Write a protein that binds this DNA or RNA. Structure first.
Ligand SMILES: [Mg+2]
Ligand SMILES: [Mg+2]
Ligand SMILES: [Mg+2]
Ligand SMILES: [Mg+2]
Ligand SMILES: [Mg+2]
Ligand SMILES: [Mg+2]
Ligand SMILES: [Mg+2]
Ligand SMILES: [Mg+2]
Ligand SMILES: [Mg+2]
Ligand SMILES: [Mg+2]
Ligand SMILES: [Mg+2]
Ligand SMILES: [Mg+2]
Ligand SMILES: [Mg+2]
Ligand SMILES: [Mg+2]
Ligand SMILES: [Mg+2]
Ligand SMILES: [O]
Ligand SMILES: [O]
Ligand SMILES: [O]
Length: 87
RNA sequence: GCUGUAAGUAAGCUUUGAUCCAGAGAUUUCCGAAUGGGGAAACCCAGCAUGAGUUAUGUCAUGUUAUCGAUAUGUGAAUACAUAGCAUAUCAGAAGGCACACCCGGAGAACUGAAACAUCUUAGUACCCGGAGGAAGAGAAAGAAAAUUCGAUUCCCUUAGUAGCGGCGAGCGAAAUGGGAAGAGCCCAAACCAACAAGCUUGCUUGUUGGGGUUGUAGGACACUCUAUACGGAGUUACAAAGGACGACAUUAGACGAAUCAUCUGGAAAGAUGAAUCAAAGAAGGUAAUAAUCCUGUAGUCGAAAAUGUUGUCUCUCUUGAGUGGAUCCUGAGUACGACGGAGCACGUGAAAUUCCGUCGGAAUCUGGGAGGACCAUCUCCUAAGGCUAAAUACUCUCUAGUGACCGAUAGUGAACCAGUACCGUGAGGGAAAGGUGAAAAGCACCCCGGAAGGGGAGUGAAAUAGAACCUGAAACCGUGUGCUUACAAGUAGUCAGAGCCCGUUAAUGGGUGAUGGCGUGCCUUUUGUAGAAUGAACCGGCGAGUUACGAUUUGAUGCAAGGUUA
RNA sequence: AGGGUAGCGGAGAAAUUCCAAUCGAACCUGGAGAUAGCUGGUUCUCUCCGAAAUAGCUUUAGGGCUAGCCUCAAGUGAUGA
RNA sequence: GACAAUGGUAGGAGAGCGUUCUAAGGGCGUUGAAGCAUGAUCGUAAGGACAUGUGGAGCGCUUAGAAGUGAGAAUGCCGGUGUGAGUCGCGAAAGACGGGUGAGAAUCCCGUCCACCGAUUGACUAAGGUUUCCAGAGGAAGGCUCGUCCGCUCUGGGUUAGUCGGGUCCUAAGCUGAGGCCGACAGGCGUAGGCGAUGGAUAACAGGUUGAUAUUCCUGUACCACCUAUAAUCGUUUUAAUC
RNA sequence: UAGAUAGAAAAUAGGUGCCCGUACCGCAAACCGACACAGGUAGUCAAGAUGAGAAUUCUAAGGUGAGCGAGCGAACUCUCG
RNA sequence: AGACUCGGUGAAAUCAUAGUACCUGUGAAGAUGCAGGUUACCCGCGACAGGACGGAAAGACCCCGUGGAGCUUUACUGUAG
């Protein structure tokens, strides 16, 4: 439900980090974001592409802090905890 | 975001709202009841009309073409009449399929039990056939019963394994009174009238509609008195007559949907440590390890353009309802009943009622007839010989939502995976084995030997002795090395004693080996008795055999007590 | 080569021979977990007690029933040896 | 503290251990669960703890309840592994040499010789099987050895008809069979007609050609039916030409 | 012949001509026989010398060398002289 | 030709554990496994075949079963016709 906005990945390899997302993959439920870099290899010794994680993620717009995203009233449109700006 | 499982590549689509979800609609090749003919199922061959293309034939497109019946036609003649037949047209008719379930009907067995068996039982079960339903059957008293009588049917309890049937053996087995679930009663036939009809006896009667009328405490007709009036009404489309309008509710896609931060460990926290929060939501599952406060979610609330289903009110239809009197008529005929053979009723021919079947005989008409377990009498009750009928009930191929002191890959569906498959058989038919990498594919770049395969290295990853025949990885079985020991030796193979050599524990009367001596004929089963040359086991792993309901009986406990107890 | 007859049956130059490698009555499914007085098998330890192989009847003698002989819990109460 | 008993099958009575699950309570667990393995330990027994290694996520304990509750033996079912055994066999048969290939050849290709069948181990078709056919690669298993090869795998590719066998022609045996006769239902019989060839009738030959097709392709030469176009014969639509 | 129907077409030119099957083995390695199995598997052609002859012996056409072999040359079994 | 040695490939019915003598005796009354004596260094390979009451086939003979089928008849009871 996300198309390249901000997040804070909290509960994975290394946390406290943020970044912006690529394909959400609705079926596998796995998003692509800067924060994991597999050492893939083809015939280079390594490749350093970008890999995915399950949704252990959260958004942050006004508080500059993770909150439970909360799609609220119809004006649909997002309406977060403390502040209500677009997703 | 998408182009299924099923990767991958390339081409492309998508806020001008894809894909996806739900409802309607359009298409829906061929076989198959198969239906134009034929046919080895999925092929072939035609016909007629119309219409494509040819100069023209060949060739094609669409439509149409079976049988049966049941209506309307014409036509029919072996015989003149006119029927049998014949050609044509109409029908949303039927045929078939199935859920091996539940129901009714036709037909209908044997092993077995009886300690054998023929009566009998199993059983009126199985399978077969047929029909219909979503439920069926039954059904509104020619009952039950014996009183302060009740007044369709069905099912559950109970009466009762009682009364009874029975080579009186096996065994079989009610019904009623009573307590409950559901509760519903109605139309014909007939005598009477009108109409039309052939015989018109110019007598009226039969033939067809409409009325008319539906019963035991007798009723209707017929005669008479009032109600109603084309309606005051009851209507009730689930019987009772068969048609149609218009609101509410549920279903088939969905949405909202409160709440948490940090330190340590970690590859990774959802854990420990602390301090905080929501609760109509601490159900559940997933999330790199065990989460109410990360996601999906739940409590609760909202929501349907269209379609369906059930319900409601006006339309809608359709309808007279009682009473008396009973002069005269009517109350279901080759029926009821009897005998003869049989079946079925719990009931085997028994004294055997009551009900059905076949042959044959053969009643009555309300001052009538049937029953009340042979049969007659009195008494009591009911009125066949015509028909319809919801619910209560039985089952679940299937769907929705749920659940389990149910299984967790030799269990459980046979089937967790590409299974009614491979396979076997001519064929009916029978029938397999086979789950798991990791959190994520990050699925081993690169070097080296090698023809390859395979491997050693290097790297991804916490771990690759997790590397695809990939979690864990036992035992059999096979090896490699090694401490001790073994080449004059008669061995169910061990045990007891014990020197020598070596080693040091879940640290105690230690452990490994064992020159030599004493002693000693496996295990179960079955047996008068077995080393047994009587049987079975090749080894090891798994699997695998006194269970459950109902009832009787006793034992122990427990509660009550001349009372106790519920279905 | 194409066809027929099908098991309470058929066909048989007849032997109880053939009927999809089987025939003193084929084959598959269902009744059906048929029946068996017969054989075989019956899973984890200890403690206490402890037999019989006889009588009778049995279309019975390798089975059964009753009495004997055992065990357990009550009762009797010195009756037993 | 004394006294006495304590072998034991069928079998009777009694007390007991552990597994799976449930309920409740209380606890353990990445600072490594379960299981597994090793061990010189506890208990009278069935059995249970402990330490260590491997293992990588759930488990114990007390009380009680319900059980698909225990397996050495069924000529038991299934699975795996041996024993026999590197033992019998390797499925009639005459091959040898050279040269190539290849990582590697008694077995593969090439040739020369030799031997064998020859009313045939030859050539052609039917039934039958279903792509085995041909080319190019490959050798994991199959081939009763080896294999650089195949009828095995992978990729690609191959079957041409107016005259041929057959259908649009016929029919027996037999099968089906409108109406119809019969039967408890099912269904059984059977006329009309219809299907059904191994038979009857039916218009074609020779050569060439591909790694793989041949009366099918081309090359030449022929035939039957049919339509269209064209004319030398007909003359009531009779009869005559004519169907 | 009943019947159709105005009234042909000699030989000429031109064209039109459907479905199935067709590969391969087919006394075999490919069919039935569970096997790349010493079995069966209808039919057609079937040459040469010798011979009555499709018999027999040896050869054409053409096809094959049989899917384990090398040693030694004992028992024993089998096949032949 | 097989067997036999070497190379290649590589099964099976069976199988309680085994380091598996003989005699005379005992014994379920015919012993590798017991008692008493006797002889025998450990391990092979090729041959024979007395024993392993050897294997294979839950004895085809005999008997039992209140087992079963087929068949006969002036056995019973019934029946189609
Ligand atoms: Mg219809
Ligand atoms: Mg009678
Ligand atoms: Mg009668
Ligand atoms: Mg398992
Ligand atoms: Mg035992
Ligand atoms: Mg004896
Ligand atoms: Mg004969
Ligand atoms: Mg049985
Ligand atoms: Mg007794
Ligand atoms: Mg075992
Ligand atoms: Mg050579
Ligand atoms: Mg063919
Ligand atoms: Mg052959
Ligand atoms: Mg000759
Ligand atoms: Mg050898
Ligand atoms: O059985
Ligand atoms: O059985
Ligand atoms: O049985």
């Amino acid at each position: 439900i996300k198309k390249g906005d901000n997040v804070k990945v909290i509960a994975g390899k290394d946390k406290g980090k943020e970044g912006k997302v690529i394909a959400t993959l609705p079926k596998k439920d796995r998003v692509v974001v800067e924060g994991v870099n597999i050492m893939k290899k083809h015939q280079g010794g390594i490749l350093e592409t970008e890999a995915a994680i399950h949704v252990s993620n959260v958004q942050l717009l006004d508080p500059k802090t993770n909150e439970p995203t909360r799609v609220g009233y119809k004006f649909v449109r997002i309406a977060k905890k403390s502040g209500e700006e677009i997703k």
